[PDB]
Design an enzyme around this catalytic site. Structure first.
Site, mmCIF file in Angstrom:
data_model
loop_
_atom_site.group_PDB
_atom_site.id
_atom_site.type_symbol
_atom_site.label_atom_id
_atom_site.label_comp_id
_atom_site.label_asym_id
_atom_site.label_seq_id
_atom_site.Cartn_x
_atom_site.Cartn_y
_atom_site.Cartn_z
ATOM 1 N N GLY A 9 0.736 -1.244 0.000
ATOM 2 C CA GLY A 9 0.000 0.000 0.000
ATOM 3 C C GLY A 9 0.769 1.299 0.000
ATOM 4 O O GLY A 9 1.883 1.404 0.524
ATOM 5 N N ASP A 169 -4.430 0.624 1.570
ATOM 6 C CA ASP A 169 -3.560 -0.511 1.893
ATOM 7 C C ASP A 169 -3.690 -1.717 0.948
ATOM 8 O O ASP A 169 -3.774 -2.861 1.395
ATOM 9 C CB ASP A 169 -3.816 -0.956 3.345
ATOM 10 N N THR A 170 -3.697 -1.465 -0.356
ATOM 11 C CA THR A 170 -3.787 -2.548 -1.332
ATOM 12 C C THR A 170 -2.409 -3.190 -1.509
ATOM 13 O O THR A 170 -1.420 -2.697 -0.961
ATOM 14 C CB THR A 170 -4.338 -2.034 -2.669
ATOM 15 O OG1 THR A 170 -3.503 -0.987 -3.179
ATOM 16 C CG2 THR A 170 -5.736 -1.494 -2.457
ATOM 17 N N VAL A 171 -2.330 -4.285 -2.257
ATOM 18 C CA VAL A 171 -1.052 -4.977 -2.403
ATOM 19 C C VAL A 171 -0.605 -5.271 -3.831
ATOM 20 O O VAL A 171 -1.411 -5.321 -4.758
ATOM 21 C CB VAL A 171 -1.082 -6.309 -1.620
ATOM 22 C CG1 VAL A 171 -1.380 -6.047 -0.155
ATOM 23 C CG2 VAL A 171 -2.147 -7.223 -2.203
#
Lengths: 341, 338
Positions: A9, A169-171
């Site tokens: 993120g 907060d993505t990946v």
């Protein structure tokens, strides 16, 4: 021989929670290297990294995803193979623990379709159909009580209340194997209280990730993964844009000009009061393989982790904007080099 | 004042159905011109054109779309505005007669607009449409006698639409709608729903001297892997529009490394390019260059200038010597809008 760079993120990572963010990035890097050392395909390597990142209850992807307007979980994920240039992706996918696995399997099947197999198989499936296709292909289904956490459920109620009155907060991950083949993947839970059926950048070709091996008009094998405000990344088709800019000799300068000119100052986001996004990039060229890795972002901070198979220990780090810089108006960029056998 | 160019698919139009395709293109153009003259926005005009195209039982879009694996209709559609650069799209949508109208609503809401959604799929897109006043549509209304027979046929084992427009101020817009591949798996989303792939519209700006609008048709997968619509828009920023589009169709499509494993690349595009060529500071004129290009056997198009008030229809066909999937046909013209 092998290298991986992952991210957890682009947004804001407090000093108090930094530790947790970096730990999942460390574990994701290890999972990726294990696959490479075991002779796995580059795609299976980035998928392994993403599975680990999704599985963390602290990431907005897979388990722990933001609950939408209805209090349901719908995920977006995609992956690309630089050697075959094939792609796989799912959008608004619920009921599946690891969205990236489905995207990976769509990519695999697509490869099977090239060896003479009727019309091209699907590369992009959404909703109920994506779920059915996953199940029918042996992919584990996951109940709502497991996808949802006490904290995401609690944030849902709060968010709802705030309307009647983290998501960043993505990946993602990028990998390059010992032969110089690259691959990239990205996964996201989307915007916290999004309308059902809303699909973000993590599912869109060219927007969420990009992987392209060296070719006639592609001197370097390049892989890119994104994070930040989904809408900003889509309107600018950022991943692919960064990949194309990286064909210039000076990678650091090319990425910097892109983030400034093609992103922050982009006419497509002209009406926005601050542009939010980050990227991780890998560029490789055969000589051994010379690998250049970088991360750039306009957000307050971005969590990254990278590891070389020959080195052995993952390095994790929270990249922050320097004093004076303003989130959404300035760019942070750092990188390094590594040579692979 | 204004100009419109539409297409009723890139694939193969039999001589026996030609007049039908051309007729639908004539009405779509008239529909768009009527909007422009009524003082409407370019996006509203392209939407009106697409509604007419969709409503034809001869087109794989809206009513008459190919039935999927389960015999159900799932549509893809998108629209882009050149002035605001805003976008609207829907994928795998069922129960709605005019997918493009839902995409246009999404774009409009986005303009009024954290940023609203520009892309909705499945049940969600359906719910959203109903919630904003667009009534649902039962299965029998969107299923024609042909698609049903085709389905039963298929189970016993490229007629998509689009349009590009330029208003009197030089603002462009583009839209595209498709029913997708016959018997496709549920949830399969194609080119018509993806940003950069289905259509593209971008007014003159810092990096682009020309206002451009592009709409596509043909093999969904081929158009997606090459992000053709946007690629064409960028190519059209070159001085010679005709040569630029030709080179793009040859090198970035037919010879694209992204389609190397395929035996024949199938697709077509309609494009519009505009710029102000003159003014009388003591009234202005827009130079509008329009083209259509394809690698399929044929492509049906129609265009109309508000000032000429005479819709023109035409089926572009590969001449003897050109092989579908291997060659590029290209035609175009120019007109001035006062």
């Amino acid at each position: 021989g092998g290298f991986v760079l992952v991210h957890a993120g682009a947004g804001y990572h407090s000093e108090s929670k930094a530790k947790e963010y970096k730990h999942v990035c460390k574990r994701a890097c290890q999972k990726a290297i294990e696959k490479l050392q075991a002779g796995a395909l580059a795609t299976d390597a980035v998928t392994a990294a993403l599975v680990e990142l999704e599985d963390s209850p602290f990431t907005n992807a897979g388990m722990g995803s933001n609950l939408n307007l209805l209090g349901e979980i719908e995920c977006d994920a995609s992956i690309m193979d630089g050697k075959s240039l094939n792609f796989g992706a799912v959008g608004a996918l619920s009921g599946i623990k690891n969205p990236v696995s489905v995207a990976n399997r769509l990519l695999c099947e697509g490869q099977k379709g090239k060896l003479s197999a009727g019309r091209i198989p699907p590369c992009f499936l959404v909703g109920e159909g994506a779920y059915r296709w996953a199940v029918d292909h042996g992919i584990p289904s996951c109940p709502p009580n497991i996808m949802t956490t006490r904290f995401s459920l609690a944030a849902f109620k709060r968010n709802k209340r705030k309307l009647e009155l983290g998501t960043l907060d993505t990946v993602g991950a990028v990998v390059v194997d010992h032969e110089g083949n690259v691959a990239a993947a990205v996964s996201s839970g989307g915007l916290a209280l999004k309308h059902p059926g809303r699909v973000g950048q993590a599912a869109l070709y060219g927007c969420g990730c990009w992987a392209e091996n060296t070719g006639a008009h592609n001197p370097y094998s390049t892989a890119v993964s994104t994070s930040g405000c989904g809408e900003h990344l889509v309107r600018t088709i950022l991943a692919r844009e960064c990949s194309h800019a990286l064909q210039a000799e000076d990678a650091h300068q090319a990425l910097l000009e892109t983030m400034q000119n093609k992103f922050i100052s982009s006419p497509f986001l002209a009406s926005e009061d601050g542009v939010l996004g980050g990227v991780i990039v890998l560029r490789s060229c055969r000589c051994t393989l010379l690998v250049e890795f970088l991360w750039s972002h306009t957000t307050e901070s971005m969590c990254v982790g990278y590891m070389s198979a020959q080195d052995g220990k993952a390095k994790t780090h929270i990249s922050r904007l320097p004093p004076g810089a303003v989130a959404g108006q300035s760019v942070a960029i750092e990188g390094g080099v590594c040579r692979l056998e």
